Tab-separated table of C-alpha atoms in Angstrom:
chain	number	residue	atom	x	y	z
A	1	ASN	CA	-141.050	119.112	-24.990
A	2	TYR	CA	-143.810	118.930	-27.595
A	3	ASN	CA	-144.162	115.199	-27.724
A	4	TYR	CA	-147.049	114.144	-25.513
A	5	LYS	CA	-150.596	115.503	-25.201
A	6	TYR	CA	-153.697	115.682	-23.277
A	7	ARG	CA	-157.319	116.483	-23.919
A	8	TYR	CA	-159.675	118.972	-22.298
A	9	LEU	CA	-163.045	118.620	-24.022
A	10	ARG	CA	-165.865	116.010	-23.990
A	11	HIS	CA	-169.596	116.254	-24.082
A	12	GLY	CA	-169.913	114.915	-20.550
A	13	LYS	CA	-167.559	113.784	-17.918
A	14	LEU	CA	-165.838	110.361	-17.395
A	15	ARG	CA	-167.247	107.328	-15.721
A	16	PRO	CA	-164.400	105.968	-13.730
A	17	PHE	CA	-161.482	104.276	-15.631
A	18	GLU	CA	-163.072	104.568	-18.993
A	19	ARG	CA	-160.411	105.153	-21.695
A	20	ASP	CA	-160.682	106.145	-25.309
A	21	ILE	CA	-157.797	107.045	-27.790
A	22	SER	CA	-160.492	108.495	-30.011
A	23	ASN	CA	-159.091	111.728	-31.261
A	24	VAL	CA	-162.289	113.346	-32.668
A	25	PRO	CA	-162.404	116.338	-35.085
A	26	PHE	CA	-164.530	118.056	-32.558
A	27	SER	CA	-167.579	120.393	-32.929
A	28	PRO	CA	-169.710	121.831	-30.148
A	29	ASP	CA	-172.834	119.812	-31.257
A	30	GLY	CA	-171.423	116.797	-33.157
A	31	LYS	CA	-171.095	117.972	-36.762
A	32	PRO	CA	-168.383	116.011	-38.663
A	33	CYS	CA	-165.887	118.573	-39.672
A	34	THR	CA	-162.419	118.917	-41.203
A	35	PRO	CA	-161.012	121.283	-38.616
A	36	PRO	CA	-160.020	124.230	-38.147
A	37	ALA	CA	-163.278	125.377	-39.706
A	38	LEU	CA	-165.344	127.581	-37.405
A	39	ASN	CA	-166.732	125.428	-34.545
A	40	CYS	CA	-164.539	122.563	-35.913
A	41	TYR	CA	-161.722	121.615	-33.570
A	42	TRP	CA	-159.362	119.130	-32.028
A	43	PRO	CA	-159.046	118.322	-28.352
A	44	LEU	CA	-155.366	117.190	-28.214
A	45	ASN	CA	-152.824	119.587	-26.681
A	46	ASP	CA	-149.161	119.558	-25.974
A	47	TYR	CA	-147.533	120.399	-22.642
A	48	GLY	CA	-144.878	123.179	-22.730
B	1	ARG	CA	-162.923	95.124	-47.513
B	2	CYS	CA	-166.413	96.354	-46.608
B	3	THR	CA	-168.086	93.282	-47.913
B	4	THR	CA	-171.799	93.575	-47.538
B	5	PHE	CA	-174.877	91.349	-48.004
B	6	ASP	CA	-178.482	92.047	-49.131
B	7	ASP	CA	-181.268	89.889	-47.778
B	8	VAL	CA	-182.266	92.108	-44.897
B	9	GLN	CA	-185.515	91.061	-43.136
B	10	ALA	CA	-186.507	92.923	-40.022
B	11	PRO	CA	-189.365	91.357	-38.056
B	12	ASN	CA	-192.284	92.590	-35.887
B	13	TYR	CA	-189.721	93.248	-32.987
B	14	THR	CA	-190.798	89.995	-31.362
B	15	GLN	CA	-191.554	90.375	-27.615
B	16	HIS	CA	-190.881	87.853	-24.936
B	17	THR	CA	-191.363	87.626	-21.165
B	18	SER	CA	-188.058	87.872	-19.162
B	19	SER	CA	-189.475	84.964	-17.186
B	20	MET	CA	-187.079	84.069	-14.350
B	21	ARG	CA	-183.657	84.632	-15.817
B	22	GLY	CA	-180.726	86.796	-15.016
B	23	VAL	CA	-179.593	85.613	-11.635
B	24	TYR	CA	-175.901	85.070	-10.985
B	25	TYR	CA	-173.337	85.029	-8.135
B	26	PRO	CA	-172.978	88.526	-7.009
B	27	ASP	CA	-169.610	88.161	-5.548
B	28	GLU	CA	-166.946	85.413	-4.986
B	29	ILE	CA	-168.251	84.486	-1.550
B	30	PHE	CA	-170.046	81.301	-0.479
B	31	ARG	CA	-172.799	81.320	2.099
B	32	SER	CA	-175.184	78.699	3.230
B	33	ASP	CA	-178.785	78.435	4.237
B	34	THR	CA	-179.556	82.087	4.329
B	35	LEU	CA	-181.312	85.031	2.641
B	36	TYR	CA	-179.024	87.687	1.353
B	37	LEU	CA	-180.047	91.055	-0.040
B	38	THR	CA	-178.235	93.136	-2.581
B	39	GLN	CA	-178.832	96.081	-4.903
B	40	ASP	CA	-176.932	95.654	-8.239
B	41	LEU	CA	-177.273	95.965	-11.930
B	42	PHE	CA	-179.650	93.113	-12.625
B	43	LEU	CA	-182.144	91.891	-15.201
B	44	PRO	CA	-185.646	93.166	-14.109
B	45	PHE	CA	-188.064	90.424	-13.726
B	46	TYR	CA	-190.892	89.398	-16.001
B	47	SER	CA	-190.406	91.959	-18.622
B	48	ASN	CA	-190.029	92.793	-22.304
B	49	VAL	CA	-187.382	90.770	-24.376
B	50	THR	CA	-186.473	91.496	-28.067
B	51	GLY	CA	-186.224	88.033	-29.540
B	52	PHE	CA	-184.274	87.409	-32.748
B	53	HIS	CA	-185.661	84.596	-34.969
B	54	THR	CA	-183.345	84.222	-37.900
B	55	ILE	CA	-184.061	82.234	-41.013
B	56	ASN	CA	-182.509	82.202	-44.561
B	57	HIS	CA	-184.301	85.525	-45.299
B	58	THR	CA	-183.932	86.967	-41.852
B	59	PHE	CA	-180.376	88.063	-41.067
B	60	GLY	CA	-180.777	89.432	-37.638
B	61	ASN	CA	-177.702	91.840	-37.059
B	62	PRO	CA	-178.544	95.533	-36.888
B	63	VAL	CA	-176.862	97.945	-34.531
B	64	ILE	CA	-178.050	97.533	-30.872
B	65	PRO	CA	-177.204	99.854	-27.932
B	66	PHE	CA	-175.414	98.559	-24.838
B	67	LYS	CA	-177.523	100.322	-22.159
B	68	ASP	CA	-175.054	99.316	-19.392
B	69	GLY	CA	-174.827	95.644	-20.025
B	70	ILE	CA	-177.219	93.170	-21.647
B	71	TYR	CA	-178.732	89.950	-20.672
B	72	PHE	CA	-178.010	87.731	-23.667
B	73	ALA	CA	-179.113	84.241	-24.641
B	74	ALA	CA	-178.863	81.851	-27.565
B	75	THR	CA	-180.646	78.656	-28.303
B	76	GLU	CA	-178.294	76.930	-30.616
B	77	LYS	CA	-177.360	73.704	-32.313
B	78	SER	CA	-173.499	73.465	-31.829
B	79	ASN	CA	-173.123	77.109	-31.001
B	80	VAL	CA	-173.421	79.053	-34.360
B	81	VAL	CA	-173.371	82.838	-33.674
B	82	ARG	CA	-170.195	83.505	-31.824
B	83	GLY	CA	-168.716	86.990	-31.883
B	84	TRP	CA	-169.516	90.196	-29.991
B	85	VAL	CA	-168.531	93.577	-31.375
B	86	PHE	CA	-168.437	96.137	-28.457
B	87	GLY	CA	-167.417	99.598	-29.231
B	88	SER	CA	-168.552	103.316	-29.517
B	89	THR	CA	-168.597	104.385	-33.113
B	90	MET	CA	-168.206	100.901	-34.663
B	91	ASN	CA	-165.502	101.986	-37.175
B	92	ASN	CA	-161.787	102.668	-37.771
B	93	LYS	CA	-161.828	105.584	-35.409
B	94	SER	CA	-163.474	103.510	-32.649
B	95	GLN	CA	-161.264	101.741	-30.083
B	96	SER	CA	-163.523	98.631	-29.729
B	97	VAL	CA	-163.168	95.246	-28.239
B	98	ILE	CA	-164.235	92.079	-30.152
B	99	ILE	CA	-165.025	88.568	-28.717
B	100	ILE	CA	-164.543	85.837	-31.288
B	101	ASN	CA	-163.275	82.312	-31.564
B	102	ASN	CA	-160.676	80.266	-33.515
B	103	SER	CA	-163.205	77.408	-33.335
B	104	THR	CA	-161.118	75.875	-30.438
B	105	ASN	CA	-160.588	78.726	-28.074
B	106	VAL	CA	-161.534	82.332	-27.297
B	107	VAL	CA	-159.663	85.360	-28.726
B	108	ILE	CA	-160.535	88.859	-27.542
B	109	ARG	CA	-158.966	91.968	-28.931
B	110	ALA	CA	-159.321	95.688	-28.532
B	111	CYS	CA	-157.914	98.525	-30.806
B	112	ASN	CA	-159.030	100.727	-33.636
B	113	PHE	CA	-160.998	98.338	-35.669
B	114	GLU	CA	-162.744	99.196	-38.937
B	115	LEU	CA	-165.927	97.311	-39.711
B	116	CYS	CA	-167.081	95.968	-43.004
B	117	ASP	CA	-170.682	97.218	-43.636
B	118	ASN	CA	-171.932	93.546	-43.187
B	119	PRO	CA	-168.950	91.158	-42.611
B	120	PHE	CA	-169.773	87.449	-42.427
B	121	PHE	CA	-168.293	84.091	-41.218
B	122	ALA	CA	-168.459	82.158	-44.414
B	123	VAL	CA	-169.304	78.906	-42.725
B	124	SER	CA	-170.301	75.979	-44.854
B	125	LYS	CA	-173.580	74.107	-44.379
B	126	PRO	CA	-172.237	70.511	-43.966
B	127	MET	CA	-168.687	71.418	-43.021
B	128	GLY	CA	-168.244	74.420	-40.772
B	129	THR	CA	-165.264	76.179	-42.279
B	130	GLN	CA	-164.733	79.557	-40.692
B	131	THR	CA	-163.642	81.006	-44.002
B	132	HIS	CA	-163.833	84.765	-43.401
B	133	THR	CA	-162.877	85.389	-39.750
B	134	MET	CA	-160.652	88.249	-40.956
B	135	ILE	CA	-162.137	90.869	-38.798
B	136	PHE	CA	-159.081	91.858	-36.753
B	137	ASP	CA	-158.366	94.153	-39.757
B	138	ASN	CA	-156.440	97.300	-38.977
B	139	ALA	CA	-154.172	98.162	-36.108
B	140	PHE	CA	-152.930	101.534	-34.951
B	141	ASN	CA	-153.172	103.205	-31.752
B	142	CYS	CA	-154.050	99.836	-30.173
B	143	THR	CA	-154.658	98.550	-26.639
B	144	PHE	CA	-155.251	94.882	-25.925
B	145	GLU	CA	-155.316	91.205	-26.841
B	146	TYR	CA	-156.203	88.125	-24.762
B	147	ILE	CA	-156.311	84.389	-25.153
B	148	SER	CA	-158.170	82.045	-22.861
B	149	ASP	CA	-157.947	78.188	-23.006
B	150	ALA	CA	-159.401	75.801	-25.367
B	151	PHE	CA	-162.402	73.393	-25.020
B	152	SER	CA	-165.041	71.780	-27.077
B	153	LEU	CA	-165.996	74.571	-29.520
B	154	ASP	CA	-168.313	73.523	-32.363
B	155	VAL	CA	-169.786	75.413	-35.299
B	156	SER	CA	-171.959	73.466	-37.620
B	157	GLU	CA	-175.759	72.798	-38.241
B	158	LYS	CA	-177.832	70.143	-36.615
B	159	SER	CA	-181.382	68.917	-35.862
B	160	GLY	CA	-183.082	67.753	-32.625
B	161	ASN	CA	-183.118	69.640	-29.400
B	162	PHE	CA	-182.123	73.178	-28.321
B	163	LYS	CA	-179.547	71.605	-26.129
B	164	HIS	CA	-177.293	74.646	-26.296
B	165	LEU	CA	-179.287	77.063	-24.217
B	166	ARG	CA	-176.380	79.305	-23.404
B	167	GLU	CA	-176.907	82.508	-21.510
B	168	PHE	CA	-174.404	85.351	-21.406
B	169	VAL	CA	-174.751	88.249	-18.981
B	170	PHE	CA	-172.411	91.120	-19.990
B	171	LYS	CA	-172.198	93.669	-17.280
B	172	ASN	CA	-170.268	96.987	-17.197
B	173	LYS	CA	-168.536	98.092	-14.024
B	174	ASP	CA	-165.399	100.392	-13.859
B	175	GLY	CA	-164.206	99.231	-17.272
B	176	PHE	CA	-164.886	95.805	-16.075
B	177	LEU	CA	-167.037	93.620	-18.318
B	178	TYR	CA	-168.354	90.824	-16.148
B	179	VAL	CA	-168.997	87.813	-18.396
B	180	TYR	CA	-171.030	85.113	-17.024
B	181	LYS	CA	-172.204	81.642	-18.216
B	182	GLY	CA	-174.831	79.023	-17.532
B	183	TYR	CA	-176.290	75.933	-19.092
B	184	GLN	CA	-179.722	74.475	-19.403
B	185	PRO	CA	-181.328	71.529	-21.336
B	186	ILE	CA	-184.335	72.514	-23.303
B	187	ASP	CA	-186.000	72.288	-26.796
B	188	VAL	CA	-188.679	74.893	-27.310
B	189	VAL	CA	-190.625	75.357	-30.535
B	190	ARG	CA	-189.200	78.815	-31.056
B	191	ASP	CA	-189.518	80.904	-27.817
B	192	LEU	CA	-187.961	81.402	-24.363
B	193	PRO	CA	-188.397	78.395	-22.096
B	194	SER	CA	-190.048	79.139	-18.781
B	195	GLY	CA	-187.476	78.646	-15.990
B	196	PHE	CA	-184.373	80.011	-14.318
B	197	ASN	CA	-180.772	79.329	-14.971
B	198	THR	CA	-178.230	80.369	-12.302
B	199	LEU	CA	-175.206	82.085	-13.957
B	200	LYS	CA	-171.584	81.880	-12.738
B	201	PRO	CA	-168.828	84.356	-12.636
B	202	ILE	CA	-166.626	83.015	-15.407
B	203	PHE	CA	-164.745	86.218	-16.620
B	204	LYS	CA	-163.899	89.688	-15.651
B	205	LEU	CA	-162.138	91.957	-17.942
B	206	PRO	CA	-159.601	94.801	-17.279
B	207	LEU	CA	-160.459	96.811	-20.296
B	208	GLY	CA	-161.883	100.343	-19.863
B	209	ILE	CA	-163.487	101.543	-23.018
B	210	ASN	CA	-166.660	103.591	-23.784
B	211	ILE	CA	-168.928	100.667	-24.334
B	212	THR	CA	-172.108	102.084	-25.997
B	213	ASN	CA	-172.839	100.364	-29.204
B	214	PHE	CA	-172.591	96.737	-30.229
B	215	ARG	CA	-173.430	93.960	-32.522
B	216	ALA	CA	-173.354	90.180	-32.583
B	217	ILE	CA	-171.615	88.164	-35.250
B	218	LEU	CA	-173.486	85.431	-37.136
B	219	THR	CA	-172.237	82.810	-39.607
B	220	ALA	CA	-173.172	83.278	-43.290
B	221	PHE	CA	-173.989	79.690	-44.388
B	222	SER	CA	-172.529	79.040	-47.752
B	223	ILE	CA	-174.061	84.465	-49.710
B	224	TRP	CA	-175.454	83.955	-46.208
B	225	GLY	CA	-177.743	81.374	-44.638
B	226	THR	CA	-178.898	80.223	-41.163
B	227	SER	CA	-180.670	77.293	-39.398
B	228	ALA	CA	-183.586	77.417	-37.033
B	229	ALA	CA	-181.982	79.211	-34.189
B	230	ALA	CA	-182.800	82.372	-32.192
B	231	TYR	CA	-180.969	84.819	-29.966
B	232	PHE	CA	-182.229	86.881	-27.149
B	233	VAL	CA	-181.333	90.313	-25.847
B	234	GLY	CA	-182.499	92.392	-22.891
B	235	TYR	CA	-181.335	95.392	-20.864
B	236	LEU	CA	-180.061	95.690	-17.339
B	237	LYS	CA	-181.098	98.050	-14.513
B	238	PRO	CA	-180.014	98.682	-10.951
B	239	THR	CA	-182.606	97.201	-8.691
B	240	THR	CA	-182.700	95.149	-5.423
B	241	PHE	CA	-182.881	91.377	-5.279
B	242	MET	CA	-183.232	88.897	-2.436
B	243	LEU	CA	-181.506	85.559	-3.236
B	244	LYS	CA	-181.989	82.274	-1.427
B	245	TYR	CA	-179.296	79.821	-0.653
B	246	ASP	CA	-179.720	76.164	0.152
B	247	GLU	CA	-177.655	74.317	2.650
B	248	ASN	CA	-176.081	72.711	-0.565
B	249	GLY	CA	-174.904	76.413	-1.130
B	250	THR	CA	-176.504	77.259	-4.469
B	251	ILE	CA	-178.965	79.942	-5.627
B	252	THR	CA	-182.372	78.353	-5.844
B	253	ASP	CA	-184.686	81.309	-5.944
B	254	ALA	CA	-184.702	85.104	-6.104
B	255	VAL	CA	-187.253	87.945	-5.779
B	256	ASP	CA	-186.758	91.420	-7.059
B	257	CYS	CA	-187.961	94.353	-4.991
B	258	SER	CA	-189.155	96.653	-7.626
B	259	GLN	CA	-191.411	94.196	-9.273
B	260	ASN	CA	-194.615	93.742	-7.235
B	261	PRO	CA	-195.911	94.948	-3.847
B	262	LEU	CA	-195.979	91.206	-3.205
B	263	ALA	CA	-192.335	91.034	-4.294
B	264	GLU	CA	-191.358	94.125	-2.416
B	265	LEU	CA	-192.907	92.895	0.794
B	266	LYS	CA	-191.037	89.618	0.212
B	267	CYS	CA	-187.824	91.455	0.197
B	268	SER	CA	-189.119	93.779	3.086
C	1	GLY	CA	-155.779	88.571	3.575
C	2	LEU	CA	-157.541	87.353	6.666
C	3	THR	CA	-156.100	87.798	10.181
C	4	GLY	CA	-157.839	87.040	13.371
C	5	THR	CA	-157.774	84.194	16.026
C	6	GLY	CA	-159.618	80.898	16.299
C	7	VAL	CA	-160.012	77.139	16.164
C	8	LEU	CA	-159.475	75.541	12.757
C	9	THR	CA	-160.850	72.149	11.509
C	10	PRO	CA	-161.372	70.853	7.891
C	11	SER	CA	-164.167	72.036	5.695
C	12	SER	CA	-167.618	70.302	5.507
C	13	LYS	CA	-169.118	71.897	2.408
C	14	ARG	CA	-170.291	71.576	-1.115
C	15	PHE	CA	-167.723	74.320	-1.663
C	16	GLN	CA	-167.709	75.840	-5.174
C	17	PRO	CA	-164.242	76.152	-6.694
C	18	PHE	CA	-164.523	79.922	-7.575
C	19	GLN	CA	-165.519	80.798	-3.980
C	20	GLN	CA	-163.086	81.184	-1.137
C	21	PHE	CA	-164.806	82.506	1.986
C	22	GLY	CA	-167.835	81.802	4.072
C	23	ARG	CA	-169.295	84.826	5.903
C	24	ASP	CA	-172.040	82.716	7.139
C	25	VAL	CA	-174.657	84.782	8.934
C	26	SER	CA	-173.357	88.244	8.577
C	27	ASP	CA	-169.773	88.857	7.318
C	28	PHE	CA	-168.385	86.172	9.707
C	29	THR	CA	-165.842	84.087	7.883
C	30	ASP	CA	-166.202	80.587	9.431
C	31	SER	CA	-164.900	78.692	6.374
C	32	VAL	CA	-162.009	79.129	3.954
C	33	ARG	CA	-159.691	77.203	1.565
C	34	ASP	CA	-156.022	76.924	2.410
C	35	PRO	CA	-153.708	78.520	-0.253
C	36	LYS	CA	-151.687	75.318	-0.472
C	37	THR	CA	-154.503	72.833	-1.313
C	38	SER	CA	-156.582	71.995	1.755
C	39	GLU	CA	-160.000	73.063	2.814
C	40	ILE	CA	-160.831	74.383	6.316
C	41	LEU	CA	-163.665	75.524	8.589
C	42	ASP	CA	-162.621	78.396	10.988
C	43	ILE	CA	-164.710	78.479	14.146
C	44	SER	CA	-163.008	81.547	15.610
C	45	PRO	CA	-164.501	81.193	19.229
C	46	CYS	CA	-161.408	79.628	20.768
C	47	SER	CA	-163.652	80.192	23.748
C	48	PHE	CA	-164.991	83.080	25.815
């Protein structure tokens, strides 16, 4: 069931009931990337 | 269409006293003839205020940070500078909320909303035509829209008093923007009047987004232009106030704790 | 939401429209608005 995803990375935790749909091409210190370059990632992930 | 203007004038970062303003009703609960403490995100007394004095050279709209809610005010002449842009990265990959008007009523909307680099309400100088209120541009992976009810909502340019001293406290709490309102009759030369204005709990919002970065929206008089108006911005901080309620049941005075040993003893 | 026991009477206020309760000295309700358009004080000491 590869439809729906979660995330598992953010620089910081969540203040309560604060929602973002912002899929960020993540890097460990900012760094606007086209992933999957080294230290250039996505946070979204399916379920299994 | 990232339409952008040019005549950018940035002032001396004009400073003002946060004289006695920022008090509102902390809950939805009446009391009478009493002295009630609370500790809540309030405007600190008597403190620094970044004024915004805008003229036909001075287009006051850079990026400003939220810092957990702002005290806001505007001294206007039929209420020119409607529109708040509240988001995180201020672009197409930012799920932001926007507070604008259809010149009759309030429309608020939250989604992925790309900004122009300097968009503009192309409002005419004798007419008031909101020509370019396009700004609800793109819509994918969206969240929210809301419509309140209509009232007297004017746009254009005047002369005389600063009759529209409107004061808007925008306070973040559990995804809940608390939006207050309050009215006061003034005409200052160009600064903050000395006095208080009790604010009232008009709006709460159920939204829940990472509100960090924001702008106001002006009106380009028609190329941009403005009249002799000014808007005020200050930051909020979680300190402790004593209010005072009359037997009429209205806030008449308040004293912060973290201001003055005089003030702290007053709330002690 | 309010239960309890007492002696009602109509309101005697300058009651604001957004408010509903009275909690007068310390969280002691003493004044309310009926949910079907009337306005009432609630002196809960029946007696004792």
